[PDB]
Amino acid sequence: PSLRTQPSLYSGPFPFYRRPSELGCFSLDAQRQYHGDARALRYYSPPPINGPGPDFDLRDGYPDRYQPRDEEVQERLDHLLRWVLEHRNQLEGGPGWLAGATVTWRGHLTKLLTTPYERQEGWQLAASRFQGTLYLSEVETPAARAQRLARPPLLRELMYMGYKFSQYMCADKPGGSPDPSGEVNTNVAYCSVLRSRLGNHPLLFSGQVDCLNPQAPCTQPPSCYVQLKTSKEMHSPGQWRSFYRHKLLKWWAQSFLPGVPHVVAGFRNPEGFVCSLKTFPTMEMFENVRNDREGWNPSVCMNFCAAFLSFAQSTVVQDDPRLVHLFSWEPGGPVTVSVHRDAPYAFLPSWYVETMTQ
Ligand SMILES: Cc1cc2nc3c(=O)[nH]c(=O)nc-3n(C[C@H](O)[C@H](O)[C@H](O)COP(=O)(O)OP(=O)(O)OC[C@H]3O[C@@H](n4cnc5c(N)ncnc54)[C@H](O)[C@@H]3OP(=O)(O)O)c2cc1C
């Protein structure tokens, strides 16, 4: 029993995808402590329209003002489960809504969406059904762990530069001014909790949101959110084409799911300065590849993801939070399934299971 991933199998009409609704949010502070509020949300504050163009030094502060979170601390779904546990009797959708839902991180859904086009990096997703609800939690592959531990200094600094860009673009208060003089502490995060549905599969998922734009005409989340990105400056049409084909696919997938309507990109030069800014509306990203023989097709992304959810739902018959069906995928093959009990794959914690059962 396996699931093929080739684009040609999934190029029919765009499937049903429910307009996402924000159910709530949560924040992680500088000590990685959870707070069920928006204290970590910051506010879009781009360079003033009359002043100079951007010239953001994305290396400033690296590494002495860098407090990276410990990537060896395993969190899986725990922060999302805390939100669900604390809102389980306040959830919209009527009686039994959660029981028919699939609960996961937005980023896990993104990797599903990009699978038909992914040539380099495989994935593993652990699945457990508990009180009807299907939980999906990513598992770091052996190869991914090796690459992480061997991360080159350049990529460590590049990751810093991505976080640093937000500090130049965002303020702590609406209408405030960015203050890049502080630390980059990657324990800090703001997460939106969203309800959607793909095909016949209701979804509850959380996703990190970079900022809210107080100048946006629509103030209702997620319509007011902006995602921030950096990417190399491009000079030739061929470079733009490669960017549309490969980078925009992942940017589109990531912001389409939570209904974030704009991605603002800072283009950085080889010396690590952002000297150009461009806004990419999410609903217009596909226009750059629509008549492109080597482009991507949002319908393929969503139809494959729907097929995976149907496959996972039919595969995971047993309701048991200690049982895991591990879905494994590598470029050039189908998604395959193996079954495991308890450690190390089981990921629903007793504090969640015991509260929900009582
Ligand atoms: C071994 C391991 C270490 C991880 N360490 C982190 C971490 O230190 N911080 C974190 O936020 N998530 C980390 N994750 C991923 C989390 O488990 C979880 O999937 C994610 O944080 C859920 O938030 P989403 O918004 O759904 O994640 P996504 O939509 O995938 O990405 C949103 C943002 O998360 C950051 N991020 C996502 N994945 C990673 C990663 N593998 N390593 C470092 N940063 C990442 C990054 O800022 C990214 O922005 P950008 O896309 O511009 O690069 C790690 C996963 C594994 C397997």
Author numbering: 27 to 384
Paste lines from the article.
The DXO/Rai1 family of proteins consists of mammalian DXO and fungal Rai1 and Dxo1. DXO enzymes are capable of removing the entire cap structure by hydrolyzing the phosphodiester linkage between the first and second encoded nucleotides, releasing GpppN from unmethylated capped RNA (GpppN-RNA), and they can release the intact NAD+ from NAD+-capped RNA.
A structure with strong electron density for FADP (but not FAD) was finally obtained, at 1.6 Å resolution, by soaking the compound into crystals of the E192S/E234Q/E253Q triple mutant of mDXO. FADP is situated in the active site of DXO and is in a folded conformation, such that its adenine base and flavin are π-stacked to each other, at a distance of ∼3.5 Å. The N3 atom of adenine is hydrogen-bonded to the side-chain hydroxyl of Tyr189, and the N1 atom is close to the side chain of Glu97, which is in an ion pair with Arg177. The carbonyl oxygen on C4 of flavin is hydrogen-bonded to the side chain of Arg95 and that on C2 to the side chain of E234Q. The N1 atom of flavin is hydrogen-bonded to a hydroxyl of the ribitol group, which is situated above and contacts the generally conserved Trp131 side chain. The pyrophosphate of FADP interacts with the conserved Arg132 and Gln280 residues, and the distal phosphate relative to adenine is also hydrogen-bonded to the main-chain amides of Gly133 (at the N-terminal end of helix αB) and E234Q (a ligand to the second metal ion in wild-type DXO). The 3′ phosphate group interacts with the conserved Lys255 and Gln280 residues, as well as a water molecule occupying the position of the first metal ion. No metal ions were observed in the active site of this structure. The binding mode of the pyrophosphate and the 3′ phosphate group of FADP is similar to that of 3′-NADP.
